[PDB]
Scaffold this active site. Structure first.
Site, PDB file in Angstrom:
ATOM      1  N   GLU A  17       1.145  -7.744   3.449  1.00 38.70           N
ATOM      2  CA  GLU A  17       2.331  -7.876   2.597  1.00 38.70           C
ATOM      3  C   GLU A  17       2.623  -9.314   2.212  1.00 38.70           C
ATOM      4  OE1 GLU A  17       6.215  -5.573   3.733  1.00 38.70           O
ATOM      5  OE2 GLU A  17       4.618  -4.145   3.218  1.00 38.70           O
ATOM      6  N   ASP A  26      12.332  -9.086  -4.923  1.00 33.97           N
ATOM      7  CA  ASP A  26      11.259  -8.080  -4.883  1.00 33.97           C
ATOM      8  C   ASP A  26      11.196  -7.198  -6.145  1.00 33.97           C
ATOM      9  OD1 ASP A  26      13.350  -6.170  -4.453  1.00 33.97           O
ATOM     10  OD2 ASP A  26      12.754  -5.703  -2.389  1.00 33.97           O
ATOM     11  N   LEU A  36      14.821  -7.118   3.750  1.00 34.41           N
ATOM     12  CA  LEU A  36      15.944  -7.039   2.819  1.00 34.41           C
ATOM     13  C   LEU A  36      17.192  -7.652   3.454  1.00 34.41           C
ATOM     14  CD1 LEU A  36      16.932  -5.623   0.003  1.00 34.41           C
ATOM     15  CD2 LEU A  36      18.003  -4.027   1.562  1.00 34.41           C
ATOM     16  N   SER A 119      -3.971  14.539   4.890  1.00 36.15           N
ATOM     17  CA  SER A 119      -4.468  13.378   5.614  1.00 36.15           C
ATOM     18  C   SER A 119      -3.752  13.197   6.956  1.00 36.15           C
ATOM     19  CB  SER A 119      -4.344  12.120   4.761  1.00 36.15           C
ATOM     20  OG  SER A 119      -5.296  12.102   3.711  1.00 36.15           O
TER      21      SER A 119
END
Ligand SMILES: *CC(C)C(=O)NC[C@@H](NC(=O)[C@H](Cc1nc2ccc(C(C)C)cc2s1)NC(=O)CC)C1CCCCC1
Length: 356
Positions: A17, A26, A36, A119
């Site tokens: 990231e 962002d 945040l 998945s």
């Protein structure tokens, strides 16, 4: 909380990231690894100041960013455990694979991850090969190919090898460029070697475009952190990969918003640290690189400054010259002598108008 992991997870998301030490947007006020702060900058800095316990003025250390990150991990895990679709898979997973699941939650949120029903079932079932093949077939794999491949490798192997091997490849590449007198930076010789390997002149526009993409602080300086973070964010693990990224960087600059960003970055990069303005000779040298084929009056502008200004160029003046170049008529007839331009540009138009 000391009993709850967290060491490898911080480095894992630092690579995937990115770690920002100053308050950013962002597209929301954020800092560290996607932390945040609020939903006003005064309110954002107040929240940051309260969380850290000092007057940060929106700038933090890596250790402070780590404290914030650990809180986000703890919140992520609490959220995963309340989610009926995520809790069974998380519970069944070993520590390394749980870190890869938290990585996904950090990227696309709980609902985003819950969408991978097939998945997630394969993961719960410990069908690593099948899950790894299935995850690579999604839009997630196409949107962030480098990050996704690393996360999928974490699920396929249950090891940190994708992160360990990228760091190895980057540390070996770095060793070719590091300063013999200072291991923590790339010196004059190293920068020249880097440009030689890219088959570019260090004073070329292509190298300036690369500095912009690397968010490099200053010309003729190149820190290890700039090298590491730059290569990782760009998805490059070799000179050949970085070389192949140059056309894409060039195309981006055809869009005026990106060009404006690169143009303004040039000023900050070109200037000397400790000085607020850009020395005239340096400003002219960089203007010839960035305004080549965009400004009809570039040479007359250079002559005007060398003969009538003979001083530093402030940031606002640098920024406004791009607007002047775009709007100015070939005969300068649309120039508004009482239309808010810097006095220096008014003086240039007055000097230039008789010379046509
Ligand atoms: C510092 C020095 C001796 C010098 O000659 N400075 C003025 C000229 N600047 C350059 O040649 C710089 C050199 C570079 N600095 C960096 C920093 C980081 C990177 C990484 C890979 C992102 C790369 C480079 S090359 N080059 C530039 O600024 C690119 C245009 C100056 C250049 C412009 C013409 C006048 C001379």
């Amino acid at each position: 909380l000391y009993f709850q992991n967290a060491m490898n997870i911080f480095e894992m998301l630092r690579i995937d990231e990115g770690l920002r030490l100053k308050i950013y947007k962002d597209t929301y006020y954020t800092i560290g690894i996607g932390h945040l702060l609020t939903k006003s900058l005064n309110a954002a800095k107040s929240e940051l100041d309260k969380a850290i316990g000092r007057n940060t003025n929106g700038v933090i250390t890596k250790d402070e960013a780590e404290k914030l990150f650990n809180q986000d991990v703890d919140a992520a895990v609490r959220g995963i455990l309340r989610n009926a679709k995520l809790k069974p898979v998380y519970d069944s997973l070993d520590a390394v694979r749980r870190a890869a699941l938290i990585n996904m939650v950090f990227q696309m949120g709980e609902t985003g991850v819950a969408g991978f029903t097939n998945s997630l079932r394969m993961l719960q079932q410990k069908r690593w090969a099948e899950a790894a093949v299935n995850l690579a077939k999604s839009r997630w794999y196409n949107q962030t190919p480098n990050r996704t491949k690393r996360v999928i490798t974490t699920f396929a192997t249950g090891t940190w090898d994708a992160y360990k091997n990228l760091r190895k490849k980057l540390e070996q590449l770095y060793n070719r460029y590091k300063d013999p007198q200072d291991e923590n930076k790339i010196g004059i010789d190293g920068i020249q070697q880097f440009c030689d390997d890219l088959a570019l002149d260090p004073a070329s526009i292509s190298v300036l475009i690369i500095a912009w993409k690397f968010r490099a602080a200053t010309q003729c300086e190149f820190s290890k952190q700039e090298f590491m973070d730059g290569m990782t964010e760009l998805g490059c693990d070799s000179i050949e990969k970085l070389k192949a990224q140059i056309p894409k960087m060039e195309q981006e600059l055809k869009e005026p918003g990106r060009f404006k960003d690169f143009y303004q970055f040039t000023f900050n990069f070109a200037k000397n640290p400790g000085q607020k303005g850009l020395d005239l000779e340096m400003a002219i040298a960089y203007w010839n690189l960035v305004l080549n084929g965009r400004f009809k009056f570039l040479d007359l502008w250079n002559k005007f400054l060398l003969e009538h200004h003979k001083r530093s160029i402030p940031k606002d003046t640098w920024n406004l010259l791009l607007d002047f170049s775009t709007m100015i008529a070939d005969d300068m007839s649309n120039y508004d002598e009482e239309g808010a331009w810097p006095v220096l540009i008014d003086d240039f138009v007055e000097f230039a108008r008789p010379q046509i």
